[PDB]
PDB file of all heavy atoms in Angstrom:
ATOM      1  N   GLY A  35     254.589  11.304  24.138  1.00 46.79           N
ATOM      2  CA  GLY A  35     254.169  12.182  23.061  1.00 46.79           C
ATOM      3  C   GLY A  35     253.135  11.621  22.105  1.00 46.79           C
ATOM      4  O   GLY A  35     252.672  12.360  21.226  1.00 46.79           O
ATOM      5  N   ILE A  36     252.745  10.355  22.236  1.00 47.05           N
ATOM      6  CA  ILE A  36     251.815   9.736  21.285  1.00 47.05           C
ATOM      7  C   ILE A  36     250.382  10.138  21.598  1.00 47.05           C
ATOM      8  O   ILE A  36     249.880   9.843  22.690  1.00 47.05           O
ATOM      9  CB  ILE A  36     251.923   8.205  21.291  1.00 47.05           C
ATOM     10  CG1 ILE A  36     253.342   7.781  20.949  1.00 47.05           C
ATOM     11  CG2 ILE A  36     250.906   7.591  20.335  1.00 47.05           C
ATOM     12  CD1 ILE A  36     253.939   7.036  22.048  1.00 47.05           C
ATOM     13  N   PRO A  37     249.683  10.774  20.672  1.00 49.04           N
ATOM     14  CA  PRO A  37     248.291  11.145  20.913  1.00 49.04           C
ATOM     15  C   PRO A  37     247.442   9.925  21.230  1.00 49.04           C
ATOM     16  O   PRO A  37     247.642   8.846  20.650  1.00 49.04           O
ATOM     17  CB  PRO A  37     247.859  11.805  19.592  1.00 49.04           C
ATOM     18  CG  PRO A  37     248.983  11.608  18.646  1.00 49.04           C
ATOM     19  CD  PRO A  37     250.215  11.366  19.438  1.00 49.04           C
ATOM     20  N   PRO A  38     246.492  10.057  22.167  1.00 51.71           N
ATOM     21  CA  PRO A  38     245.678   8.892  22.557  1.00 51.71           C
ATOM     22  C   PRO A  38     244.961   8.200  21.411  1.00 51.71           C
ATOM     23  O   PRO A  38     244.884   6.963  21.412  1.00 51.71           O
ATOM     24  CB  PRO A  38     244.691   9.497  23.568  1.00 51.71           C
ATOM     25  CG  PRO A  38     245.529  10.524  24.262  1.00 51.71           C
ATOM     26  CD  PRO A  38     246.394  11.143  23.164  1.00 51.71           C
ATOM     27  N   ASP A  39     244.427   8.940  20.434  1.00 52.31           N
ATOM     28  CA  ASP A  39     243.704   8.326  19.320  1.00 52.31           C
ATOM     29  C   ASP A  39     244.595   7.460  18.442  1.00 52.31           C
ATOM     30  O   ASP A  39     244.077   6.735  17.582  1.00 52.31           O
ATOM     31  CB  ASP A  39     243.035   9.405  18.467  1.00 52.31           C
ATOM     32  CG  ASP A  39     241.857  10.068  19.170  1.00 52.31           C
ATOM     33  OD1 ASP A  39     241.724   9.932  20.411  1.00 52.31           O
ATOM     34  OD2 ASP A  39     241.056  10.727  18.471  1.00 52.31           O
ATOM     35  N   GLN A  40     245.915   7.542  18.608  1.00 53.28           N
ATOM     36  CA  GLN A  40     246.836   6.661  17.906  1.00 53.28           C
ATOM     37  C   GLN A  40     247.234   5.448  18.738  1.00 53.28           C
ATOM     38  O   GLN A  40     248.078   4.666  18.297  1.00 53.28           O
ATOM     39  CB  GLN A  40     248.094   7.432  17.476  1.00 53.28           C
ATOM     40  CG  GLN A  40     247.824   8.392  16.319  1.00 53.28           C
ATOM     41  CD  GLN A  40     249.045   9.157  15.903  1.00 53.28           C
ATOM     42  OE1 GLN A  40     250.030   9.240  16.645  1.00 53.28           O
ATOM     43  NE2 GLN A  40     249.004   9.716  14.697  1.00 53.28           N
ATOM     44  N   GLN A  41     246.659   5.268  19.923  1.00 54.51           N
ATOM     45  CA  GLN A  41     247.026   4.160  20.797  1.00 54.51           C
ATOM     46  C   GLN A  41     245.927   3.102  20.836  1.00 54.51           C
ATOM     47  O   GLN A  41     244.761   3.413  21.113  1.00 54.51           O
ATOM     48  CB  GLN A  41     247.302   4.636  22.222  1.00 54.51           C
ATOM     49  CG  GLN A  41     248.236   5.808  22.362  1.00 54.51           C
ATOM     50  CD  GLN A  41     248.304   6.259  23.802  1.00 54.51           C
ATOM     51  OE1 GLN A  41     248.175   5.444  24.727  1.00 54.51           O
ATOM     52  NE2 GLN A  41     248.471   7.564  24.010  1.00 54.51           N
ATOM     53  N   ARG A  42     246.306   1.859  20.557  1.00 56.52           N
ATOM     54  CA  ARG A  42     245.536   0.686  20.948  1.00 56.52           C
ATOM     55  C   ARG A  42     246.207   0.104  22.180  1.00 56.52           C
ATOM     56  O   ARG A  42     247.422  -0.111  22.177  1.00 56.52           O
ATOM     57  CB  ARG A  42     245.499  -0.381  19.846  1.00 56.52           C
ATOM     58  CG  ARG A  42     245.035   0.081  18.474  1.00 56.52           C
ATOM     59  CD  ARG A  42     245.418  -0.956  17.372  1.00 56.52           C
ATOM     60  NE  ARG A  42     244.783  -2.263  17.588  1.00 56.52           N
ATOM     61  CZ  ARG A  42     245.249  -3.417  17.114  1.00 56.52           C
ATOM     62  NH1 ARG A  42     246.363  -3.444  16.386  1.00 56.52           N
ATOM     63  NH2 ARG A  42     244.605  -4.551  17.376  1.00 56.52           N
ATOM     64  N   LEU A  43     245.432  -0.127  23.229  1.00 58.86           N
ATOM     65  CA  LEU A  43     245.906  -0.864  24.391  1.00 58.86           C
ATOM     66  C   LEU A  43     245.175  -2.197  24.485  1.00 58.86           C
ATOM     67  O   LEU A  43     243.943  -2.250  24.410  1.00 58.86           O
ATOM     68  CB  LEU A  43     245.711  -0.061  25.678  1.00 58.86           C
ATOM     69  CG  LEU A  43     246.626   1.149  25.835  1.00 58.86           C
ATOM     70  CD1 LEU A  43     246.127   2.029  26.963  1.00 58.86           C
ATOM     71  CD2 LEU A  43     248.033   0.666  26.111  1.00 58.86           C
ATOM     72  N   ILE A  44     245.945  -3.261  24.684  1.00 57.57           N
ATOM     73  CA  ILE A  44     245.468  -4.634  24.662  1.00 57.57           C
ATOM     74  C   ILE A  44     245.869  -5.306  25.965  1.00 57.57           C
ATOM     75  O   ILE A  44     247.015  -5.176  26.412  1.00 57.57           O
ATOM     76  CB  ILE A  44     246.057  -5.402  23.465  1.00 57.57           C
ATOM     77  CG1 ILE A  44     245.578  -4.781  22.147  1.00 57.57           C
ATOM     78  CG2 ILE A  44     245.720  -6.890  23.566  1.00 57.57           C
ATOM     79  CD1 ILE A  44     246.394  -5.205  20.947  1.00 57.57           C
ATOM     80  N   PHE A  45     244.917  -6.014  26.579  1.00 55.48           N
ATOM     81  CA  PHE A  45     245.169  -6.814  27.768  1.00 55.48           C
ATOM     82  C   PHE A  45     244.326  -8.071  27.671  1.00 55.48           C
ATOM     83  O   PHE A  45     243.157  -8.004  27.280  1.00 55.48           O
ATOM     84  CB  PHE A  45     244.824  -6.059  29.060  1.00 55.48           C
ATOM     85  CG  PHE A  45     245.155  -6.830  30.323  1.00 55.48           C
ATOM     86  CD1 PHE A  45     246.470  -7.160  30.627  1.00 55.48           C
ATOM     87  CD2 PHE A  45     244.151  -7.226  31.198  1.00 55.48           C
ATOM     88  CE1 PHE A  45     246.786  -7.868  31.787  1.00 55.48           C
ATOM     89  CE2 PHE A  45     244.461  -7.931  32.370  1.00 55.48           C
ATOM     90  CZ  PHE A  45     245.781  -8.251  32.659  1.00 55.48           C
ATOM     91  N   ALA A  46     244.921  -9.216  28.011  1.00 56.49           N
ATOM     92  CA  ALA A  46     244.227 -10.506  27.901  1.00 56.49           C
ATOM     93  C   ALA A  46     243.710 -10.723  26.483  1.00 56.49           C
ATOM     94  O   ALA A  46     242.592 -11.193  26.275  1.00 56.49           O
ATOM     95  CB  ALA A  46     243.075 -10.608  28.916  1.00 56.49           C
ATOM     96  N   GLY A  47     244.505 -10.325  25.497  1.00 54.12           N
ATOM     97  CA  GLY A  47     244.083 -10.464  24.124  1.00 54.12           C
ATOM     98  C   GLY A  47     242.935  -9.586  23.683  1.00 54.12           C
ATOM     99  O   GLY A  47     242.430  -9.777  22.572  1.00 54.12           O
ATOM    100  N   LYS A  48     242.503  -8.628  24.499  1.00 55.28           N
ATOM    101  CA  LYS A  48     241.352  -7.791  24.180  1.00 55.28           C
ATOM    102  C   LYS A  48     241.770  -6.332  24.098  1.00 55.28           C
ATOM    103  O   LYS A  48     242.540  -5.847  24.938  1.00 55.28           O
ATOM    104  CB  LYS A  48     240.231  -7.932  25.229  1.00 55.28           C
ATOM    105  CG  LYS A  48     240.020  -9.355  25.720  1.00 55.28           C
ATOM    106  CD  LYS A  48     238.932 -10.079  24.930  1.00 55.28           C
ATOM    107  CE  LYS A  48     238.837 -11.556  25.328  1.00 55.28           C
ATOM    108  NZ  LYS A  48     237.886 -12.324  24.475  1.00 55.28           N
ATOM    109  N   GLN A  49     241.250  -5.631  23.093  1.00 53.34           N
ATOM    110  CA  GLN A  49     241.430  -4.190  23.066  1.00 53.34           C
ATOM    111  C   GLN A  49     240.634  -3.574  24.205  1.00 53.34           C
ATOM    112  O   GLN A  49     239.467  -3.909  24.420  1.00 53.34           O
ATOM    113  CB  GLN A  49     240.989  -3.590  21.734  1.00 53.34           C
ATOM    114  CG  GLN A  49     241.422  -2.143  21.600  1.00 53.34           C
ATOM    115  CD  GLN A  49     241.066  -1.542  20.261  1.00 53.34           C
ATOM    116  OE1 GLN A  49     241.857  -1.590  19.313  1.00 53.34           O
ATOM    117  NE2 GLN A  49     239.864  -0.974  20.172  1.00 53.34           N
ATOM    118  N   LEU A  50     241.279  -2.681  24.937  1.00 49.73           N
ATOM    119  CA  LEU A  50     240.693  -2.055  26.108  1.00 49.73           C
ATOM    120  C   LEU A  50     239.875  -0.845  25.681  1.00 49.73           C
ATOM    121  O   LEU A  50     240.305  -0.052  24.841  1.00 49.73           O
ATOM    122  CB  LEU A  50     241.805  -1.651  27.071  1.00 49.73           C
ATOM    123  CG  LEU A  50     242.699  -2.847  27.398  1.00 49.73           C
ATOM    124  CD1 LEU A  50     243.680  -2.483  28.483  1.00 49.73           C
ATOM    125  CD2 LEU A  50     241.834  -4.039  27.818  1.00 49.73           C
ATOM    126  N   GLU A  51     238.685  -0.720  26.252  1.00 48.17           N
ATOM    127  CA  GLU A  51     237.732   0.326  25.904  1.00 48.17           C
ATOM    128  C   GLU A  51     238.034   1.577  26.730  1.00 48.17           C
ATOM    129  O   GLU A  51     238.203   1.488  27.955  1.00 48.17           O
ATOM    130  CB  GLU A  51     236.313  -0.202  26.156  1.00 48.17           C
ATOM    131  CG  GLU A  51     235.151   0.717  25.815  1.00 48.17           C
ATOM    132  CD  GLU A  51     233.838   0.261  26.480  1.00 48.17           C
ATOM    133  OE1 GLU A  51     233.424  -0.900  26.244  1.00 48.17           O
ATOM    134  OE2 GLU A  51     233.244   1.048  27.261  1.00 48.17           O
ATOM    135  N   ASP A  52     238.087   2.741  26.063  1.00 46.85           N
ATOM    136  CA  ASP A  52     238.528   3.985  26.700  1.00 46.85           C
ATOM    137  C   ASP A  52     237.848   4.243  28.039  1.00 46.85           C
ATOM    138  O   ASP A  52     238.497   4.677  28.998  1.00 46.85           O
ATOM    139  CB  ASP A  52     238.272   5.184  25.783  1.00 46.85           C
ATOM    140  CG  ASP A  52     239.251   5.270  24.629  1.00 46.85           C
ATOM    141  OD1 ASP A  52     240.392   4.785  24.772  1.00 46.85           O
ATOM    142  OD2 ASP A  52     238.868   5.829  23.581  1.00 46.85           O
ATOM    143  N   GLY A  53     236.537   4.014  28.110  1.00 47.51           N
ATOM    144  CA  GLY A  53     235.774   4.488  29.252  1.00 47.51           C
ATOM    145  C   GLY A  53     235.781   3.587  30.466  1.00 47.51           C
ATOM    146  O   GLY A  53     235.271   3.982  31.518  1.00 47.51           O
ATOM    147  N   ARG A  54     236.339   2.393  30.358  1.00 45.72           N
ATOM    148  CA  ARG A  54     236.378   1.475  31.483  1.00 45.72           C
ATOM    149  C   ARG A  54     237.700   1.589  32.227  1.00 45.72           C
ATOM    150  O   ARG A  54     238.676   2.155  31.727  1.00 45.72           O
ATOM    151  CB  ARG A  54     236.159   0.056  30.994  1.00 45.72           C
ATOM    152  CG  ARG A  54     234.948  -0.014  30.093  1.00 45.72           C
ATOM    153  CD  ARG A  54     234.292  -1.360  30.142  1.00 45.72           C
ATOM    154  NE  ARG A  54     235.284  -2.417  30.263  1.00 45.72           N
ATOM    155  CZ  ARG A  54     234.976  -3.690  30.466  1.00 45.72           C
ATOM    156  NH1 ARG A  54     233.696  -4.047  30.549  1.00 45.72           N
ATOM    157  NH2 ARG A  54     235.941  -4.598  30.562  1.00 45.72           N
ATOM    158  N   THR A  55     237.715   1.045  33.436  1.00 43.80           N
ATOM    159  CA  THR A  55     238.838   1.179  34.356  1.00 43.80           C
ATOM    160  C   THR A  55     239.772  -0.020  34.252  1.00 43.80           C
ATOM    161  O   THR A  55     239.407  -1.082  33.748  1.00 43.80           O
ATOM    162  CB  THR A  55     238.344   1.324  35.805  1.00 43.80           C
ATOM    163  OG1 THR A  55     237.597   0.156  36.175  1.00 43.80           O
ATOM    164  CG2 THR A  55     237.451   2.556  35.959  1.00 43.80           C
ATOM    165  N   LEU A  56     240.999   0.166  34.746  1.00 43.14           N
ATOM    166  CA  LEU A  56     241.897  -0.969  34.912  1.00 43.14           C
ATOM    167  C   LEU A  56     241.274  -2.017  35.831  1.00 43.14           C
ATOM    168  O   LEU A  56     241.443  -3.228  35.614  1.00 43.14           O
ATOM    169  CB  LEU A  56     243.246  -0.505  35.452  1.00 43.14           C
ATOM    170  CG  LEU A  56     243.994   0.526  34.594  1.00 43.14           C
ATOM    171  CD1 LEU A  56     245.188   1.094  35.344  1.00 43.14           C
ATOM    172  CD2 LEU A  56     244.453  -0.074  33.270  1.00 43.14           C
ATOM    173  N   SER A  57     240.533  -1.570  36.853  1.00 42.50           N
ATOM    174  CA  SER A  57     239.888  -2.518  37.758  1.00 42.50           C
ATOM    175  C   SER A  57     238.854  -3.360  37.023  1.00 42.50           C
ATOM    176  O   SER A  57     238.723  -4.561  37.288  1.00 42.50           O
ATOM    177  CB  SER A  57     239.251  -1.783  38.943  1.00 42.50           C
ATOM    178  OG  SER A  57     238.464  -2.656  39.748  1.00 42.50           O
ATOM    179  N   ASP A  58     238.120  -2.748  36.077  1.00 42.96           N
ATOM    180  CA  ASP A  58     237.133  -3.487  35.292  1.00 42.96           C
ATOM    181  C   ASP A  58     237.751  -4.669  34.568  1.00 42.96           C
ATOM    182  O   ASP A  58     237.078  -5.677  34.364  1.00 42.96           O
ATOM    183  CB  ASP A  58     236.465  -2.581  34.262  1.00 42.96           C
ATOM    184  CG  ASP A  58     235.458  -1.662  34.877  1.00 42.96           C
ATOM    185  OD1 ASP A  58     234.889  -2.039  35.924  1.00 42.96           O
ATOM    186  OD2 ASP A  58     235.234  -0.561  34.318  1.00 42.96           O
ATOM    187  N   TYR A  59     239.012  -4.559  34.154  1.00 43.02           N
ATOM    188  CA  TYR A  59     239.687  -5.618  33.420  1.00 43.02           C
ATOM    189  C   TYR A  59     240.548  -6.503  34.310  1.00 43.02           C
ATOM    190  O   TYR A  59     241.249  -7.372  33.790  1.00 43.02           O
ATOM    191  CB  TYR A  59     240.561  -5.022  32.307  1.00 43.02           C
ATOM    192  CG  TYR A  59     239.782  -4.380  31.178  1.00 43.02           C
ATOM    193  CD1 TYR A  59     239.837  -3.008  30.964  1.00 43.02           C
ATOM    194  CD2 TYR A  59     239.016  -5.148  30.306  1.00 43.02           C
ATOM    195  CE1 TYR A  59     239.140  -2.419  29.923  1.00 43.02           C
ATOM    196  CE2 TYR A  59     238.314  -4.567  29.267  1.00 43.02           C
ATOM    197  CZ  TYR A  59     238.377  -3.201  29.085  1.00 43.02           C
ATOM    198  OH  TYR A  59     237.685  -2.608  28.060  1.00 43.02           O
ATOM    199  N   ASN A  60     240.542  -6.278  35.624  1.00 45.08           N
ATOM    200  CA  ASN A  60     241.330  -7.062  36.577  1.00 45.08           C
ATOM    201  C   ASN A  60     242.831  -6.895  36.341  1.00 45.08           C
ATOM    202  O   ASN A  60     243.612  -7.838  36.513  1.00 45.08           O
ATOM    203  CB  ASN A  60     240.930  -8.546  36.554  1.00 45.08           C
ATOM    204  CG  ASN A  60     241.252  -9.254  37.864  1.00 45.08           C
ATOM    205  OD1 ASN A  60     241.280  -8.622  38.930  1.00 45.08           O
ATOM    206  ND2 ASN A  60     241.524 -10.559  37.792  1.00 45.08           N
ATOM    207  N   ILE A  61     243.247  -5.694  35.949  1.00 44.53           N
ATOM    208  CA  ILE A  61     244.663  -5.395  35.772  1.00 44.53           C
ATOM    209  C   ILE A  61     245.241  -5.095  37.150  1.00 44.53           C
ATOM    210  O   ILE A  61     244.728  -4.228  37.860  1.00 44.53           O
ATOM    211  CB  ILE A  61     244.855  -4.216  34.806  1.00 44.53           C
ATOM    212  CG1 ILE A  61     244.049  -4.466  33.528  1.00 44.53           C
ATOM    213  CG2 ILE A  61     246.328  -3.996  34.512  1.00 44.53           C
ATOM    214  CD1 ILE A  61     244.307  -3.493  32.387  1.00 44.53           C
ATOM    215  N   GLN A  62     246.277  -5.836  37.547  1.00 41.48           N
ATOM    216  CA  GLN A  62     246.857  -5.698  38.878  1.00 41.48           C
ATOM    217  C   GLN A  62     248.169  -4.930  38.833  1.00 41.48           C
ATOM    218  O   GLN A  62     248.690  -4.584  37.771  1.00 41.48           O
ATOM    219  CB  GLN A  62     247.131  -7.058  39.522  1.00 41.48           C
ATOM    220  CG  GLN A  62     246.277  -8.185  39.051  1.00 41.48           C
ATOM    221  CD  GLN A  62     244.846  -8.027  39.470  1.00 41.48           C
ATOM    222  OE1 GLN A  62     244.507  -7.166  40.302  1.00 41.48           O
ATOM    223  NE2 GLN A  62     243.977  -8.833  38.877  1.00 41.48           N
ATOM    224  N   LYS A  63     248.694  -4.671  40.027  1.00 41.52           N
ATOM    225  CA  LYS A  63     250.089  -4.324  40.219  1.00 41.52           C
ATOM    226  C   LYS A  63     250.961  -5.161  39.296  1.00 41.52           C
ATOM    227  O   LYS A  63     250.792  -6.378  39.201  1.00 41.52           O
ATOM    228  CB  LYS A  63     250.496  -4.566  41.683  1.00 41.52           C
ATOM    229  CG  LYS A  63     250.093  -5.955  42.222  1.00 41.52           C
ATOM    230  CD  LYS A  63     250.958  -6.428  43.401  1.00 41.52           C
ATOM    231  CE  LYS A  63     250.235  -6.345  44.750  1.00 41.52           C
ATOM    232  NZ  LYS A  63     249.077  -7.274  44.923  1.00 41.52           N
ATOM    233  N   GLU A  64     251.883  -4.493  38.605  1.00 44.31           N
ATOM    234  CA  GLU A  64     252.893  -5.150  37.767  1.00 44.31           C
ATOM    235  C   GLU A  64     252.303  -6.045  36.672  1.00 44.31           C
ATOM    236  O   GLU A  64     252.988  -6.918  36.140  1.00 44.31           O
ATOM    237  CB  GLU A  64     253.862  -5.948  38.652  1.00 44.31           C
ATOM    238  CG  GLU A  64     253.969  -5.385  40.080  1.00 44.31           C
ATOM    239  CD  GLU A  64     254.862  -4.157  40.165  1.00 44.31           C
ATOM    240  OE1 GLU A  64     255.345  -3.698  39.108  1.00 44.31           O
ATOM    241  OE2 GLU A  64     255.130  -3.682  41.296  1.00 44.31           O
ATOM    242  N   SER A  65     251.041  -5.817  36.321  1.00 45.44           N
ATOM    243  CA  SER A  65     250.489  -6.438  35.121  1.00 45.44           C
ATOM    244  C   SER A  65     250.956  -5.691  33.864  1.00 45.44           C
ATOM    245  O   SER A  65     251.270  -4.491  33.903  1.00 45.44           O
ATOM    246  CB  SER A  65     248.963  -6.492  35.186  1.00 45.44           C
ATOM    247  OG  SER A  65     248.551  -7.307  36.274  1.00 45.44           O
ATOM    248  N   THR A  66     251.015  -6.407  32.748  1.00 45.72           N
ATOM    249  CA  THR A  66     251.579  -5.834  31.543  1.00 45.72           C
ATOM    250  C   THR A  66     250.518  -5.622  30.491  1.00 45.72           C
ATOM    251  O   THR A  66     249.759  -6.538  30.179  1.00 45.72           O
ATOM    252  CB  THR A  66     252.691  -6.728  30.982  1.00 45.72           C
ATOM    253  OG1 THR A  66     253.806  -6.704  31.884  1.00 45.72           O
ATOM    254  CG2 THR A  66     253.139  -6.235  29.609  1.00 45.72           C
ATOM    255  N   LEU A  67     250.455  -4.410  29.948  1.00 46.57           N
ATOM    256  CA  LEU A  67     249.594  -4.120  28.809  1.00 46.57           C
ATOM    257  C   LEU A  67     250.422  -4.078  27.532  1.00 46.57           C
ATOM    258  O   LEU A  67     251.647  -3.920  27.557  1.00 46.57           O
ATOM    259  CB  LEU A  67     248.854  -2.794  29.002  1.00 46.57           C
ATOM    260  CG  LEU A  67     247.584  -2.855  29.862  1.00 46.57           C
ATOM    261  CD1 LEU A  67     247.837  -3.514  31.217  1.00 46.57           C
ATOM    262  CD2 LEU A  67     247.035  -1.449  30.044  1.00 46.57           C
ATOM    263  N   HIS A  68     249.744  -4.212  26.399  1.00 46.56           N
ATOM    264  CA  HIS A  68     250.408  -4.140  25.103  1.00 46.56           C
ATOM    265  C   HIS A  68     249.905  -2.927  24.345  1.00 46.56           C
ATOM    266  O   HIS A  68     248.695  -2.752  24.180  1.00 46.56           O
ATOM    267  CB  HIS A  68     250.166  -5.399  24.273  1.00 46.56           C
ATOM    268  CG  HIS A  68     250.897  -6.595  24.785  1.00 46.56           C
ATOM    269  ND1 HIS A  68     250.251  -7.716  25.255  1.00 46.56           N
ATOM    270  CD2 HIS A  68     252.220  -6.825  24.944  1.00 46.56           C
ATOM    271  CE1 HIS A  68     251.147  -8.595  25.667  1.00 46.56           C
ATOM    272  NE2 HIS A  68     252.351  -8.078  25.491  1.00 46.56           N
ATOM    273  N   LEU A  69     250.829  -2.115  23.860  1.00 47.10           N
ATOM    274  CA  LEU A  69     250.498  -0.920  23.102  1.00 47.10           C
ATOM    275  C   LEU A  69     250.840  -1.158  21.639  1.00 47.10           C
ATOM    276  O   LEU A  69     251.991  -1.474  21.314  1.00 47.10           O
ATOM    277  CB  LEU A  69     251.260   0.291  23.638  1.00 47.10           C
ATOM    278  CG  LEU A  69     251.175   1.551  22.777  1.00 47.10           C
ATOM    279  CD1 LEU A  69     249.806   2.201  22.882  1.00 47.10           C
ATOM    280  CD2 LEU A  69     252.262   2.496  23.221  1.00 47.10           C
ATOM    281  N   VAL A  70     249.849  -0.999  20.766  1.00 44.83           N
ATOM    282  CA  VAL A  70     250.051  -1.030  19.322  1.00 44.83           C
ATOM    283  C   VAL A  70     249.648   0.331  18.777  1.00 44.83           C
ATOM    284  O   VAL A  70     248.515   0.778  18.992  1.00 44.83           O
ATOM    285  CB  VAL A  70     249.245  -2.146  18.642  1.00 44.83           C
ATOM    286  CG1 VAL A  70     249.555  -2.174  17.141  1.00 44.83           C
ATOM    287  CG2 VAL A  70     249.568  -3.495  19.277  1.00 44.83           C
ATOM    288  N   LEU A  71     250.571   1.001  18.093  1.00 44.52           N
ATOM    289  CA  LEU A  71     250.227   2.294  17.521  1.00 44.52           C
ATOM    290  C   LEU A  71     249.351   2.097  16.288  1.00 44.52           C
ATOM    291  O   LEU A  71     249.440   1.084  15.591  1.00 44.52           O
ATOM    292  CB  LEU A  71     251.486   3.081  17.168  1.00 44.52           C
ATOM    293  CG  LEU A  71     252.478   3.280  18.322  1.00 44.52           C
ATOM    294  CD1 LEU A  71     253.503   4.335  17.959  1.00 44.52           C
ATOM    295  CD2 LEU A  71     251.762   3.635  19.631  1.00 44.52           C
ATOM    296  N   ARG A  72     248.486   3.073  16.028  1.00 44.58           N
ATOM    297  CA  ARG A  72     247.583   2.970  14.894  1.00 44.58           C
ATOM    298  C   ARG A  72     247.347   4.366  14.348  1.00 44.58           C
ATOM    299  O   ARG A  72     247.473   5.356  15.072  1.00 44.58           O
ATOM    300  CB  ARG A  72     246.234   2.332  15.284  1.00 44.58           C
ATOM    301  CG  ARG A  72     245.231   3.353  15.855  1.00 44.58           C
ATOM    302  CD  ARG A  72     243.926   2.722  16.331  1.00 44.58           C
ATOM    303  NE  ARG A  72     242.959   2.500  15.255  1.00 44.58           N
ATOM    304  CZ  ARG A  72     242.174   3.444  14.748  1.00 44.58           C
ATOM    305  NH1 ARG A  72     242.250   4.683  15.213  1.00 44.58           N
ATOM    306  NH2 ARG A  72     241.321   3.153  13.773  1.00 44.58           N
ATOM    307  N   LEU A  73     247.007   4.441  13.067  1.00 45.01           N
ATOM    308  CA  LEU A  73     246.568   5.689  12.462  1.00 45.01           C
ATOM    309  C   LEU A  73     245.053   5.682  12.358  1.00 45.01           C
ATOM    310  O   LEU A  73     244.447   4.639  12.093  1.00 45.01           O
ATOM    311  CB  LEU A  73     247.193   5.893  11.087  1.00 45.01           C
ATOM    312  CG  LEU A  73     248.714   5.995  11.114  1.00 45.01           C
ATOM    313  CD1 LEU A  73     249.207   6.423   9.735  1.00 45.01           C
ATOM    314  CD2 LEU A  73     249.198   6.974  12.199  1.00 45.01           C
TER     315      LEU A  73
END
Side-chain angles (χ1 to χ4, degrees):
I36 302 119
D39 289 16
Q40 288 179 342
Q41 311 174 32
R42 307 164 62 204
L43 289 167
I44 297 164
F45 184 64
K48 320 266 174 186
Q49 191 177 269
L50 306 187
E51 182 197 303
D52 285 332
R54 311 209 323 173
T55 61
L56 301 170
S57 172
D58 284 332
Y59 292 113
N60 205 28
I61 310 189
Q62 334 292 349
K63 49 156 106 67
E64 334 281 4
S65 297
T66 292
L67 278 53
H68 288 117
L69 170 73
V70 183
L71 305 194
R72 85 184 277 280
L73 298 189

